[PDB]
C-alpha cells in the first residue's frame, strides 16, 4: 500500500537532528540504493546475482557510455549493507568517487558530495550512518514506485504542490506532438518539469527536460529528482547558474513548451550596467525590469526561448499589476503583439511559506486575437488544510473552458482588445 510505506518513510528516518541536515544523508542513501538496484537489474536482465571482480573492461566501458554510472563489481548497496556494522566509514566515501569515474561522455556528475562525516567522533559516525543505511534497507520498496518516497520526503514543512504543477503541465500541453520539450528557468526542484513524462512516455521521447537553477544544494536534489523517475540520460540535464546574468542556452533552441515558478521579486542590480539595454532579449521591451522586481525579466526571458508554435505557461505574484510606467510599458509590449493569450487567478494561499495568491500567464505566438482573462476564486477547493487540493476532474473544468475561448458567467470570459487598451492593462 502507498501510504503505508509513506508513513514508514515519515517515521523511520527522523532521528535525531534538524531535517535540513539529515536531509542530505537520507536522500543520498536512498539514491545509492536506487543506483544499486538499477544497475543490478540492468546487469542481471541470467541469474548471476552474486557478482565477482572479473569485470570485463570491454564490457565495463559500455554502461559508462550508456548509463554513465557503472557502479563496481561489489560496491552496491546489496553487498555493503549485509556486510555492514563494521569499521569503517569511508568505504562509501571512496565508493562515491569511483562511480563518478565516468569521464566520458556527458558526466552530469560530481554529485554525491553532500554526504560527509559529521558527527563528532568517528565511531559515532560509523554507528549513525550504519543506522541510516540499515533503515534504508528496512523499506518495502521491492520495484518501480521508487521516486514517490523521494517526492514525499522532499515535501517537508521547512514546495510547489503536485496539483498546481499538474495544472501548469496540462496548460502547456495540448494539441502538440512536437519537439523539443521542455525548458525551465529557475527550476528549483525537478517537480514541475516531471509531469510531462508522468504522461508523455506515451507517444515517444521528444528531447531532454532542460532546465537552469541557481542554488547548488537545490541543484543536486533537482538532478537526482528526475534521475530517480526512470528517465533516460543524455539530454535530460539541468545546468547550474542564474538565468538573468548567465543565460544558457541561447544557442539551442526556440522551444515548444516552457514552464517555471520564479521566486517573488528577487533583487538583481543589472539595470543598466552591462549592455542589457542592447542585448538579444531585453531590447525589444524598450526598458529593463526595475531594481527589485525580477518577474517580468523572467517573462521576457521566457518569450525569448519560444518558437512560432509552442506556448509559455508561467506564474506570477498577482501584484505585478500596474506598478508604475516601467511595468506598464512591459505589459504594453506584451499586449502590443499577440504574445499574451490568457491569465488565470488562483486562490490564496495555496503554498508553503506564503500568504498571497498567484496568477498564471499563458503566452503564445498564436493569434485569434482576444485575451480570455479566465479567472477562478472558487473552486479551487481551498478548504482542507492548508489548501489541499485542486483535485482531478476539478482542474478539468479549468482546462475545459480553456479549450475554445468560451464565455461562461460566475467565471470569466473573453474581452476586447480595444477594451483592454481602453483600460490601463489590468489583471
Amino acid at each position: 500500500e502507498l501510504h503505508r510505506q509513506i508513513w514508514q518513510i515519515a517515521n523511520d528516518v527522523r532521528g535525531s537532528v534538524d531535517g535540513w541536515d539529515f536531509k542530505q544523508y537520507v536522500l543520498g542513501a536512498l539514491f545509492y540504493r536506487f543506483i544499486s538496484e538499477n544497475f543490478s537489474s540492468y546487469i542481471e536482465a541470467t541469474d548471476d546475482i552474486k557478482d565477482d571482480a572479473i569485470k570485463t573492461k570491454g564490457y565495463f566501458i559500455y554502461p559508462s557510455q550508456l548509463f554513465c554510472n557503472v557502479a563496481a563489481k561489489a560496491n552496491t548497496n546489496d553487498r555493503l549493507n549485509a556486510d555492514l556494522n563494521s569499521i569503517f566509514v569511508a568505504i562509501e566515501s571512496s565508493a562515491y568517487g569511483y562511480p563518478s569515474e565516468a569521464d566520458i561522455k556527458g558526466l552530469f556528475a560530481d554529485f554525491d558530495t553532500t554526504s560527509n562525516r559529521l558527527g563528532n567522533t568517528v565511531k559515532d559516525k560509523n554507528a549513525r550512518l550504519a543506522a541510516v543505511l540499515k533503515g534504508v534497507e528496512g523499506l518495502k520498496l521491492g520495484i518501480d514506485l521508487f521516486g514517490d518516497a523521494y517526492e514525499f520526503l522532499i515535501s517537508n514543512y521547512a514546495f510547489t504542490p503536485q496539483h498546481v504543477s499538474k495544472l501548469i503541465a496540462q496548460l502547456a500541453m495540448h494539441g502538440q506532438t512536437h519537439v523539443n520539450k521542455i525548458y525551465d528557468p529557475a527550476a528549483g526542484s525537478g517537480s514541475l518539469l516531471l509531469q510531462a513524462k508522468k504522461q508523455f512516455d506515451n507517444h515517444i521521447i521528444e528531447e531532454g527536460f532542460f532546465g537552469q537553477e541557481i542554488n547548488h544544494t537545490t541543484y543536486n536534489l533537482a538532478r537526482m529528482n528526475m534521475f530517480l523517475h526512470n528517465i533516460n540520460y543524455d539530454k535530460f540535464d539541468i545546468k547550474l547558474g542564474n538565468t538573468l546574468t548567465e543565460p544558457h542556452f541561447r544557442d539551442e533552441k526556440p522551444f515548444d513548451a516552457i514552464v517555471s515558478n520564479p521566486p517573488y521579486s528577487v533583487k538583481w542590480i543589472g539595470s543598466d550596467d552591462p549592455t542589457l539595454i542592447n542585448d538579444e532579449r531585453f531590447a525589444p521591451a524598450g526598458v529593463l525590469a526595475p531594481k527589485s522586481k525580477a518577474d517580468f525579466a523572467f517573462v521576457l526571458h521566457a518569450l525569448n526561448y519560444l518558437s512560432a508554435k509552442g506556448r509559455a505557461a508561467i506564474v506570477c505574484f498577482p501584484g505585478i499589476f500596474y506598478r508604475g510606467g516601467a511595468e506598464q510599458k512591459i505589459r504594453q509590449y506584451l499586449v502590443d503583439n499577440n504574445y499574451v493569450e490568457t491569465v488565470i487567478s488562483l486562490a490564496p494561499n495555496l503554498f508553503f511559506g506564503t500568504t498571497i495568491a498567484v496568477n498564471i500567464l499563458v503566452l503564445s505566438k498564436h493569434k485569434t486575437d482576444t485575451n480570455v482573462q479566465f479567472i477562478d476564486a472558487s473552486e479551487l477547493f481551498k478548504k482542507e488544510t492548508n489548501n489541499n487540493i485542486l483535485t482531478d476532474a476539478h482542474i478539468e473544468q479549468i482546462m475545459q473552458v480553456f479549450a475554445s475561448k468560451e464565455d461562461v458567467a460566475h467565471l470569466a470570459k473573453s474581452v476586447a482588445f480595444e477594451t483592454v487598451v481602453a483600460n490601463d492593462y489590468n489583471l
Binding site: 556494522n85 569499521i87 569503517f88 566509514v89 569511508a90 566515501s93 571512496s94 568517487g97 562525516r117 567522533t121 568517528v122 565511531k123 559516525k125 554507528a127
Partner: protein
Amino acid sequence: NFIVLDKYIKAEPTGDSYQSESDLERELIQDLRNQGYEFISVKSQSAMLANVREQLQNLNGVVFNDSEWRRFTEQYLDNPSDGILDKTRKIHIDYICDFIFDDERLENIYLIDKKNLMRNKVQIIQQFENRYDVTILVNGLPLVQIELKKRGVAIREAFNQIHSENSLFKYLQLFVISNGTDTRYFANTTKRDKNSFDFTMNWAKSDNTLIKDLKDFTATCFQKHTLLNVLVNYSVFDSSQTLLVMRPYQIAATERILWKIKSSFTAKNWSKPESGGYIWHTTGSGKTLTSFKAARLATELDFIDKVFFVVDRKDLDYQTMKEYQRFSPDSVNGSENTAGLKRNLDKDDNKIIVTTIQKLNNLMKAESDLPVYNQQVVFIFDECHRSQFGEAQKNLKKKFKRYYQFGFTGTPIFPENALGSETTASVFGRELHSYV
C-alpha cells in the same frame, strides 16, 4: 598468554647503589632494550614531532607530504587550545582522525591500534632542557613517564615534592614513581593528601605477591603486550572527567574470566558446571568497575552475542546502571518489564544488558521458546554459586544451554560458613581469582 603473571621471576640486585640518580637510569635503559625497545636521541622539541610523522607511517601505511602534515599537526594532534583532559580523551575515545588528503580521499589516521596492538611501536627517550625523567613513547606520542628518585626522598614525599613549552608532554597518562627500592604508578590526579601513595598502586603477581624494586617490575610489567594492555584495554576515561586504572587483581580476574571464555569456545563447551567459574572480591573494590570491564571486553570478543549482567533488585537496577552510565556511553536497560526487554534482546551493538533475575524468570517461565536461544550468551551474576543455587538457575539449566555462567560473591558460602546454602560443586565448578 596472561598479563598479571603467575610465576615469580628472578629478582636480583645489580648494585649500582641506589643513592644515585643515573645508574638506575642506565640499568632501566639496559633492561628495556633487553626487552626489545628503541632508544633515539631528541635533544629538542620539534624533532620529537618529526619522529611522529615517521612512526605513524608504519602504523597507517600512507604517506603525508609537509602540507598535509601542517593540517594534521595544527588541527588535530597539537592543538594549542587544549590541555590535558581533552588530550586524554583523544588518547582513549577519539583516537582516530578522519583526515582528508590533498589527493582528496578520506582515510582514517589512527593513533594507537587497539585491535591488533602488536603494530603499536614503542620507543624510549630520556629528559632534556626539573628532575630526571625517562619516557616510554608510544608511536611518536609520549605515554608513560618513569620518574626516578632516591632513598632520601621517601615514597610519600616522592609524589608530594613536585605535584607549553612543551605541549607534547600533555599526552602522558601515567607517572611511574620509583626510587630504587619501591615503585608505584598512577594516573592524572594530583592532590596532596588523597592522591598520595594510598591511591597509587603496588603492581603485583597473581594472588598477593607485591613488587617493589625496578628490575622485577621491568621484567613483569614493561613487556610490550603487558604495558600496552595496561594503557589501552584496562583504563576507563570516566566522564567525571577522571582516568581510572584497574587494580592488578582486577585485571588478573578479568583475564582468567576471558581466557576461560576463550578456552571454552574453542573446545565447543557450553552448559557445563565446569564451564563456569566464580570470583571472590569482597569489598573496597568497585565491583561495578571490574564487572563492567569484564562485560565490555566480552561484548567485543566476537564469540558471543548477549551479555546479561544480572542481579537481584533491592535498588540495584537503578544503582549499578547509574554506575554504568557514569562510564558514560553505552549500557542497555533491563528496565522496566518483560515487554521491551524482548526489544532489548532484539537490538544489538550495545550488547551489555543489565536486568534483574526476577524479570528473567518472568521471561523464562513463559513466552514460548524465545528466539534468542541459540546465540552465545554470557551471564555475569552477583550473589553467585558461592551465595545461591537458586530456582532460577535450575530453570536456566532447563531452558538455556549455550551460556557461560559466571558470578561474583561478597562473602562466599564456604564449607566454613555453610549455614545458608551449598558450596560450589556442581554449579560454577572452580574458583578463578580472589582477593583478601
